[PDB]
Structure formats: structure tokens, C-alpha cells
């Protein structure tokens with residue numbers, strides 16, 4: 013493909029399926045002479061990560077720490093350079109063009125999430141800060157310094173435009189609501205536990221989310237509730253992704269190089285050690301709801317058949 | 321000129337980044353040596369066997385570039401004091417890996433964070449690395465003035481920020497550093513990279529860092545204000561802090577992205593250079609004493625030793641000291657001979673310890689200025705300086721001056737003196753044995769004779785200075801008591817230190833000594849109110865002397881003779897640092913002791929805790945009679 017690098021970098025960081033079934037890929041070189049990143053589109057997911065068979069490709073200034081679809085043609089990127097980047101597919105869907113690149117964070121941007129309004133997004137960074145973005149005007153609307161350490165994860169509510177979660181190495185899980193004069197509320201276990209590393213709102217229940225910790229525990233939390241947890245992984249829980257089923261499953265992925273699929277009670281249904289390095293993302297196919305695509309730092313794109 | 325570095329946590333490719341950083345005007349670059357997100361496993365398979373290179377090659381820069389332009393940075397995921405054992409193990413191994421790669425590259429410095437209270441395991445791993453081979457590179461501990469928890473936005477509705485003053489709590493980051501360096505046993509390779517915040521803390525919080533080994537000051541771009549033209553500037557308070565860091569001559573580091581994107585990024589650096597050239601230019605004292613900041617020297621003993629020619633030359637470069645002496649002799653002559661008696665009365669002046677003659681010349685100038693007649697004896701026991709004096713006498717002075725090559729305590733004078741003049745004073749007044757010398761010369765002073773100086777008084781003040789404590793410590797020598805270096809005073813231009821209480825008088829002597837029984841031994845108890853939390857490392861010594869009436873010399877800071885740079889202060893150390901809390905009183909006790917051969921000082925702290933008695937019987941330090 014034109015305007016696409018001959019080879020993507022080894023460390024695969026992100027994998028997101030679009031509504032039509034095309035696969036977005038994010039990768040970064042975390043060693044060697046050049047430390048940069050790249051963005052890829054695979055309308056044929058079974059051809060990934062082979063560069064020749066990609067639909068579109070572009071390489072970025074720095075590494076890709078996190079990304080997310082913006083609608084169906086936009087790609088929002090958390091960059092090592094301290095920038096949040098928005099890229100947009102052309103009408104051809106054969107190029108990936110830079111919409112804006114704004115250097116607002118003083119350290120690595122570690123996490124990004126699109127709010128349900130589709131026109132706003134939240135980013136967390138190693139500079140402790142969290143920012144609310146207006147994608148249209150390409151400006152930061154709010155900059156929040158609620159945490160006391162680097163921000164590990166931000167996750168927007170599925171259907172509340174002003175609500176999102178965050179979790180940091182200061183051992184805080186913060187529930188945000190920008191409608192409140194003080195928009196953050198510290199939630200979670202009153203007693204301090206292990207640091208939280210990943211967050212996922214339940215796709216149906218507006219009050220329910222799960223979070224993983226640095227010790228491998230996956231915890232089911234009802235905020236309006238008055239806690240369910242399981243020791244799923246032997247190392248840090250890197251991400252948690254709910255299946256698109258009516259009664260959804262929970263894919264958990266860890267630095268122990270394993271993938272796990274849990275039901276609603278955090279009981280284990282599936283387990284895959286297909287990866288030989290860190291498992292970085294996992295995305296469910298919208299077309300076949302028992303396919304789960306994981307990527308990792310071993311440069312593998314694995315298509316799991318999940319017994320549903 | 322300011323020495324500046326750029327802190328980055330993103331370097332796609334070193335040659336391009338270093339070039340852009342050099343163009344902007346920076347002298348060095350702080351960067352990661354491994355990719356900040358490249359978490360590595362060392363125990364558990366299969367992630368332990370991750371192939372490929374672990375970082376980029378040393379061949380990308382020259383040795384000289386690694387040696388002088390690159391400051392390394394510990395990866396932000398390395399947490400040796402984590403609660404999770406697996407994270408601890410991995411962080412210990414990764415810390416050693418990154419530190420060893422720094423040493424492999426020959427980096428001049430390496431940045432490690434102090435971002436929480438408990439860094440014991442971080443300290444142990446660093447200490448283990450410092451004690452692996454012999455290296456000299458520096459470790460800059462990145463510690464903020466204000467802890468991250470203490471400056472977060474008050475935007476958590478069910479966890480409001482403290483609005484109640486916590487005097488000790490707001491000093492918490494100094495304690496992080498103090499505990500860390502204490503575990504590492506005051507390693508000379510470990511220094512402070514002080515990170516400045518948007519809101520400065522109260523003056524006492526900053527003031528803890530006085531006397532600490534600050535090697536760098538980190539200024540985030542987010543703390544810069546935005547002036548009329550949009551150029552980045554700093555607040556009045558921040559400017560005061562930059563100015564007072566410029567006196568320690570630290571290196572300044574710019575971190576964060578550009579937030580004045582209309583302007584060029586170099587402008588942040590340009591403002592620092594702007595501030596640096598508008599500080600008060602060097603005074604006469606600072607111009608002469610350059611290079612001597614916190615440099616330890618053994619006190620001269622002009623009695624026991626014969627001083628070298630270039631030592632007398634240094635004594636002589638101070639016009640203020642000798643014009644003061646001239647003015648003192650001038651006023652005494654007018655007081656002693658009336659206008660009517662000016663041609664008949666010849667005053668007999670004796671310079672006791674003439675050196676190369678500066679006092680003799682000032683006495684001659686004072687005689688002409690007072691328009692009175694004087695007879696001069698120049699007494700000097702150093703036969704090498706007597707060569708200088710006798711060549712002066714033959715060529716210039718003539719028979720008005722009689723050079724005497726003798727000890728003033730043994731010389732049989734042919735007549736008595738109207739005035740004896742001497743410059744036998746050390747940094748601590750009597751520490752060259754001026755009292756013993758003038759006591760033995762006293763008998764050939766007329767019953768109404770004047771001694772210049774007539775009186776002198778030493779002053780002590782408790783000081784905090786981890787740097788200075790660390791340099792005394794380094795003065796351990798072969799073939800002697802391994803703690804002897806703490807039991808002797810040093811002449812030193814005190815620079816990087818904190819004075820903990822106002823100087824108080826210690827020992828005083830007057831001449832002539834009319835007392836029937838003369839005893840120069842002394843015992844003094846001093847109580848120093850300390851209204852700050854701190855660590856006591858020793859005592860600064862100063863002196864004041866009355867040459868004549870209102871003519872004085874002083875190195876005591878609050879009465880310092882303006883422009884005179886003849887004397888540096890003296891430093892009395894203590895073996896073990898002593899913690900002092902706000903409101904507590906430091907009590908120190910000093911003795912001046914002697915026998916027929918030696919004079920010495922002994923000292924001890926007795927509050928808030930006792931120290932050992934230092935230099936008992938002069939076992940480590942004596943002043944030869």
C-alpha cells in the first residue's frame with residue numbers, strides 16, 4: 013500500500029474492531045535505534061499483522077501508548093511525545109491522514125477514551141493530569157490534577173456524556189462527573205488494596221464496572237452497590253474488555269502473557285497462552301461474536317474462538 | 321552564563337533529538353536509556369526470554385557525547401519499594417540493568433525519583449551499585465519542593481484537600497531525601513535535583529534545602545507566567561528562588577512541553593540567561609574568593625610554622641585591613657602626643673610579628689598623616705621574612721626602623737614601647753596564639769602603653785550543611801585516628817550551608833593583660849535557639865577585634881568589615897550529625913586548653929542530645945607554642 017511503512021514495529025499495543033469488522037492496529041518500537049509508532053487498518057483481519065495485506069498504514073512521530081476509534085473513520089492516539097493525536101481515514105479508506113496533533117501533556121500520554129457524546133474524549137498521562145478534549149475545536153476544555161501519581165487508565169461511561177472512570181498509581185479509582193462542581197469522587201474499597209491497573213464499564217448496567225489490579229485480581233464493582241473478585245492472573249491485569257453479547261463475557265489480559273474469558277460471576281470459561289510476551293489488547297468481532305482478537309509484544313495477532 | 325539541560329521522556333531517535341536540543345541552546349539532555357514503557361521480565365517465562373535488543377546501541381553517540389551531554393533516567397515503571405513481591409524483584413533487576421548500562425556508557429549523571437516516603441529498597445539497590453567497582457558519576461535524586469499529594473487540585477468531593485497548616489508535614493519531601501541519603505551513608509555521588517512547583521511552599525519548606533547538595537533545579541514549563549508580549553517569565557517569588565539557586569551555581573533543567581507555542585521553545589532558556597545577567601554583579605569579596613567556596617584548608621600556624629612568601633602576599637592584597645590599622649595607629653598617636661609636643665615626643669612603636677612589613681609601612685603612613693615622630697622596631701621570628709624586612713630597611717626605611725629577628729616572647733628589648741602593633745589573629749581570633757604571644761611581649765610595653773589590637777572576641781554559630789559534613793568526612797587519612805578529621809577546625813569560605821542561629825560571642829582577650837594571674841584557658845557554654853527543623857553538622861567561627869577605640873575589624877556576618885576579604889570563617893565539625901527540631905535549643909560547650917607546649921580547643925554538644933567530647937587532650941589537633 014502507498015504511504016505505508018514497509019514493516020510495522022514489533023511491539024503491538026492496540027487492536028480495535030470497527031462496526032463493519034475492519035481491524036485497527038497500533039504498534040510501537042520499544043527498542044532498537046528508532047522509538048516511534050504506526051497506525052494500520054486491516055479490512056481483512058486474518059491478514060494481520062502482515063504489512064503487504066493491510067488496507068491503510070501510516071507511521072507516527074512517537075510510540076503509540078493507547079488508541080481508540082472516533083466514530084468509524086477517526087483514530088485518537090495517546091503518544092509518547094506528550095501529544096494526543098487525531099487521525100482520520102480518507103474517503104477512499106486507503107490513507108490515514110493527521111487531523112490534529114496537540115502537545116498538552118508534559119509526559120507520556122498513557123490512556124485515552126472517547127466520551128459517549130462522540131465529540132469529546134478524556135486522556136490520562138504520566139504527568140498525573142487528566143484532560144477533557146473537544147475533538148471539534150481541537151482544544152483542551154478542562155485539565156484536572158486530581159491524582160498524585162501517573163494515571164494508569166481512563167474509561168468513559170457508555171451512555172453518560174459527562175461520566176468517566178480513572179485509576180492511578182496513587183491507589184485511587186476516581187469516578188468523574190463534570191456536572192459536579194468538584195467532578196471527581198473517590199470510590200472503591202475503603203481499605204487500600206493493590207494498585208488498580210485497568211477499568212471497564214459494564215456495557216448494559218450504568219452503575220457497574222470491573223477493575224483489575226497489579227496483583228492479578230479482577231474485581232466486579234457496583235458503585236450504587238452495598239464486592240466480587242477473583243484472582244485471575246499471576247501478574248498485572250493490563251486490560252478488561254466486555255463481549256458484545258446481550259449477557260456479556262469479560263476478556264482479561266495480563267503481563268503473564270495469558271488471556272482469560274470470564275462470565276458474569278468472574279468464573280473462568282476460557283484460557284489462552286497463545287502469546288509469548290505481554291498481551292496488550294483484546295477486541296471482539298462484531299460480525300462473529302465468538303471471535304476474540306488479541307495482540308501482544310510478540311507481534312502476534314491471534315484470533316481466538318471463544319466457547320460461548 | 322547559565323548551565324542548562326533539557327529533560328525529555330520521549331526520544332524517537334537520539335541524533336535528531338540531541339541536535340534540536342543543542343540548537344535550542346541546552347548544554348545537556350536528560351533522557352531514558354531504555355524505553356520508558358518497555359517493561360521487562362527477568363524471572364517468569366516466556367516474557368523473560370523476549371528476543372531482540374533490550375535498548376538501542378551505544379554506537380549511536382561518541383564516547384565524549386555520552387560522557388558530557390547525556391544524563392540518564394530511571395524507567396518510570398521501576399518501583400523497588402512496591403508491595404507486590406514480583407514487582408519488587410523485577411524492579412531491583414531492572415534498576416541494576418539500567419544503572420549498569422549507565423555505567424557502561426560512562427554517563428556523568430543519572431536521575432532517580434524520590435516520589436514517595438518509603439525508598440529503602442531503592443536506597444539499598446543504589447548503594448549496592450555504588451559499591452560495585454569504583455566510579456565517580458553522579459546520581460541526581462529527583463525530589464520536589466512540594467509532594468504530589470500536597471498540590472493536587474481540590475476537585476475530589478469526598479476527599480477534600482487539607483487547609484490546616486502542617487508545619488512538619490509540609491516539610492515531608494526534605495525528610496524523603498534525608499532518610500534516603502542517610503541509608504546510603506552520605507555518599508558523595510548522591511545529590512539533589514530539586515523540582516520546583518507552580519505554587520512555592522512557605523519559606524521554611526524551601527529553607528530545609530539550605531546546605532543540601534543541590535546539583536540541579538528542575539523547572540517545569542507549567543510554572544512560567546506569560547508576560548505582555550507572551551514571552552515566558554516567572555513570578556516575583558520564583559525569581560527570588562532562581563536568584564538564590566544561582567548563588568549555589570546549580571544546573572537548571574527545563575521539563576515539560578511548550579506551553580507558549582506562539583514563541584520558540586528556547587525562550588524558556590533565554591529568560592534564565594536574562595535573570596542570570598541581572599543579578600547583583602560580583603562584589604570585591606566575591607571577586608577575590610572565587611574558587612574557595614566550601615574548600616577546606618588547615619588553619620595556618622604562623623607561630624609554629626614559618627609562612628611562605630606567597631602566603632604573606634595573600635595577606636597583603638587587602639587594603640581595607642591595613643588602612644584600618646593605619647587609622648588606628650593614626651588616632652593613637654594624636655591621643656598620645658599633643659600638638660605642642662609633636663616635635664619633641666618620639667613615640668616608640670613595635671610591630672610584633674612584622675611579616676614582610678605591611679604593618680611597618682602603615683605605621684609610617686600613620687606617622688606622617690598624624691604628623692608625629694615615631695621610632696620603629698619590626699620584630700619577626702620568621703628568618704625568611706626577615707630577609708624581606710632587612711632589604712626594606714636598607715633600601716627604603718633607613719635607621720628609623722630596627723628589624724629584630726627574634727621571638728617576641730624572648731626578645732630583650734633595649735627600651736619600652738609606646739605602642740605595640742600586631743596582626744596575630746586567625747579566623748577564630750586567638751587560634752594563632754596571639755594571647756600567648758602578646759603576653760610574653762607585654763613586659764617591654766610602657767605602663768601606659770597601648771596594644772593594637774586592644775581586644776578581640778570570637779563568635780560561634782551552629783550551621784547545617786550536609787555538603788560540608790561530607791567533605792570533612794572525606795578527609796580521613798592513612799596512619800591516624802579514622803575520626804581525627806572531625807576533631808580539628810578548618811579555614812573555609814562557607815558557602816553551601818544554613819546558619820541555624822545567630823552568632824554568639826565565645827572567647828575574649830584584652831591587651832595589655834593587667835591581671836596579676838594570667839590564665840588564657842577558657843570554658844564557655846552557649847545556648848542557640850533554633851526555630852527550624854534541621855540537622856546540625858558543625859559550628860561556624862568568626863571574630864571581631866578592636867584595633868583602637870572605635871576602629872574595628874570583623875568577619876562576623878552581621879558586623880562584617882565591608883570589602884575586607886583577609887579572613888575566611890572557621891568550621892568546627894562534629895563526628896555525628898544531630899537532629900534538631902523547631903523550638904529546640906542547641907547547647908554547645910567550648911574549652912580553650914593548654915599546657916606549656918600546646919594550645920587546643922575541645923568542644924561538645926550537650927543539647928538537644930550530647931555528642932562526644934571532641935579533641936580531648938588535643939589528641940587530633942593542637943596549636944604549637
Ligand SMILES: Cc1cc2cc(C(=O)N(Cc3ccc(C(F)(F)F)cn3)[C@H](C)c3ncccn3)ccc2nc1N
Pocket residue numbers: 608609610612617618619620622634635637743744745746747752811885886887888889
Ligand atoms: C595576617 C593573617 C591572615 C590570615 C588569613 C586567613 C585566611 O582566611 N586564609 C584563607 C584565604 C583568605 C582569603 C583569600 C582571598 F582569596 F580572598 F584572598 C584566600 N584565602 C589564609 C590565606 C589561609 N591560607 C591557607 C590556609 C589557611 N588559611 C587565616 C588566618 C590568618 N591569620 C593571619 N595572622
Ligand SMILES: CSC[C@H]1O[C@@H](n2cnc3c(N)ncnc32)[C@H](O)[C@@H]1O
Pocket residue numbers: 622623626627635672673674675676699700701702705726727728729743744757
Ligand atoms: C603577618 S602574620 C603574623 C606574623 O607574626 C609572626 N609571628 C608570630 N608569632 C611570633 C612571635 N612569637 N615572635 C615573633 N614573630 C611572630 C609570624 O611569623 C607571622 O609573620
